[PDB]
Design an enzyme around this catalytic site. Structure first.
Site, mmCIF file in Angstrom:
data_model
loop_
_atom_site.group_PDB
_atom_site.id
_atom_site.type_symbol
_atom_site.label_atom_id
_atom_site.label_comp_id
_atom_site.label_asym_id
_atom_site.label_seq_id
_atom_site.Cartn_x
_atom_site.Cartn_y
_atom_site.Cartn_z
ATOM 1 N N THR B 1 34.538 42.948 35.079
ATOM 2 C CA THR B 1 35.391 44.094 34.596
ATOM 3 C C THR B 1 34.750 44.547 33.248
ATOM 4 O O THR B 1 34.775 43.896 32.060
ATOM 5 C CB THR B 1 36.817 43.405 34.443
ATOM 6 O OG1 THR B 1 37.315 43.202 35.846
ATOM 7 C CG2 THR B 1 37.456 44.878 34.267
ATOM 8 N N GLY B 74 38.878 40.337 30.920
ATOM 9 C CA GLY B 74 39.171 39.096 31.053
ATOM 10 C C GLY B 74 40.566 38.512 30.328
ATOM 11 O O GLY B 74 41.295 39.181 30.090
ATOM 12 N N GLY B 75 40.599 37.149 30.520
ATOM 13 C CA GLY B 75 42.053 36.603 30.027
ATOM 14 C C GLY B 75 42.936 36.277 31.108
ATOM 15 O O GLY B 75 43.578 35.375 31.125
#
Lengths: 305, 149
Positions: B1, B74-75
């Site tokens: 992403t 992310g995350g």
């Protein structure tokens, strides 16, 4: 420290993509056309994380008006029926059966550009917006370390998938970081987009070449699925706060919780993370199905906890 | 992403997300195109032409005249809380707002993770100020670049 400029600014996960946007600006192009050139550049340079084979999302803030959102995500294929996945307890992750929804970004580029011709009075040639993307495909990119790592760490699982090894491997292993890596196939694709136009991906020669490939592969997608597909234009979820307005692209079910967190909004150090307490009381505010703008200070003040 | 921002000389601001959702998508490349195709089987369940239900580009306009585009890769909803509360609410400079450690549970720079965890995300931002000066910031947790003239 923060890079500051006076005319234009691009932030990107890879410095080559930042510069592709930046050139378009310096050449008189708009922020959107600069973004499109980047979407294509960052597709060649980070192919494992994004590319022409996925979906895209825009939030656009014009100098004066309301923001414009672009949901450029594709729908499941017309062959993707509840029967076709038998007594499998889920849809597979890899293989032709996992590649079941349409790829939207390119439709996002085509829509944003028509927007950028309405907002601007001008527009640059498409062949200019893809120029950097094409040349980095034919002539190569510096292999990023994360492209090498992702490829190594997925090599055993994806080794056998149609097209994988021929396209992502070098001597049958992951390419070395810092090496020159070409994509001669992707360049012919990008060169087709430049001659035929971006929308040919869904309604031109490239769409028909994509259709055959789906057939030969067993993919649950048809030419009809491509031709029938446009980027959507939903309304941004809008948050009013004391200092102004903030927008997120998300449907009311998924984005209510995040925006409510911020609506928090007397905070001017460890208390800062705790006041997380707002997030606890926020999921509660969500609790039918995926069921709206309640996110008002007249509605979040009960916070007061 | 990938997240990307662009602002041009007239003040048009763009915040963009592009993705195949998982690394290399389906593994499947489409013959003679070089296109690896995304793999969104997770956007559906088991009890055609149906669209999925989803990613979150962000942008803000401020009373004092600043426009601002940002994005986290992310995350994730706590990364937006952090950057909003730090930059907007607390006057922390933009680049510092993105760098200061975050939480899902906490970064060692304050249960307690490494000083820089890929699980707190990668966030970028551009702020345009009414004086026309343009500010880009990158996440020290990745290898992003801000390019401006």
């Amino acid at each position: 420290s923060s890079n500051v400029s006076t005319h234009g600014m691009a932030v990107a996960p890879h410095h080559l993509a930042s510069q592709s946007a930046l050139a378009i600006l310096r050449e008189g192009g708009s922020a959107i056309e600069a973004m499109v050139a980047a979407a294509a550049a960052i597709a060649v340079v980070y192919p494992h994380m994004n590319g022409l084979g996925g979906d895209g999302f825009w939030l656009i803030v014009p100098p004066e008006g309301d923001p414009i959102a672009i949901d450029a995500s594709g729908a499941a294929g017309s062959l993707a029926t509840l029967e076709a996945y038998a007594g499998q307890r889920h849809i597979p992750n890899r293989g032709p059966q996992a590649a079941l929804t349409v790829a939207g970004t390119v439709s996002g580029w085509v829509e944003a550009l028509r927007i950028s011709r309405d907002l601007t009075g001008r527009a640059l040639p498409v062949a200019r917006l893809l120029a950097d993307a094409i040349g980095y495909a034919e002539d190569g990119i510096p292999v990023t370390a994360s492209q090498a790592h992702a490829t190594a760490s997925k090599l055993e699982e994806l080794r056998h998938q149609p097209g994988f090894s021929e396209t992502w491997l070098v001597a049958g292993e992951a390419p070395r970081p810092g090496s020159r890596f070409r994509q001669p196939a992707l360049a012919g694709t990008l060169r087709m987009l430049a001659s035929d136009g971006l929308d040919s991906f869904y309604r031109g020669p490239l769409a028909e070449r994509l259709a055959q490939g789906m057939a030969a592969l067993g993919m649950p997608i048809t030419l009809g699925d491509l031709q029938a597909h446009r980027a959507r234009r939903p309304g941004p979820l809008t948050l009013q706060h004391q200092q102004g307005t903030l927008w997120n692209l998300a449907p009311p079910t998924q984005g209510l919780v995040s925006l409510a967190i911020l609506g928090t909004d007397k905070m001017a150090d460890a208390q800062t993370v705790h006041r997380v307490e707002a997030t606890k009381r926020a999921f509660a505010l969500r609790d039918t199905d995926p069921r709206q703008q309640l996110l008002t200070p007249e509605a979040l003040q009960p916070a007061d906890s | 992403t990938v997240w990307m921002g662009v602002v041009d000389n007239s003040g048009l601001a763009v915040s963009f997300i592009q993705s195949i959702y998982h690394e290399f998508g389906s593994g499947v490349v489409l013959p003679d195109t070089g296109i690896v195709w995304q793999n969104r089987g997770a956007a559906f369940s088991l009890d055609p032409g149906k669209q999925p239900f989803h990613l979150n580009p962000a942008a803000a306009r401020l009373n004092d005249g600043r426009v601002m585009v940002y994005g986290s890769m992310g995350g994730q909803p706590q990364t937006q809380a952090a950057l909003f509360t730090r930059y907007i609410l607390q006057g922390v400079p933009l680049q510092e707002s993105i760098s200061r450690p975050r939480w899902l549970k906490l970064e060692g720079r304050f249960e307690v993770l490494a000083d820089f965890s890929e699980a707190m995300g990668h966030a970028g931002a551009i702020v345009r100020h009414p004086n026309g000066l343009l500010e880009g910031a990158t996440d020290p947790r990745s290898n992003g670049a801000a390019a401006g003239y």
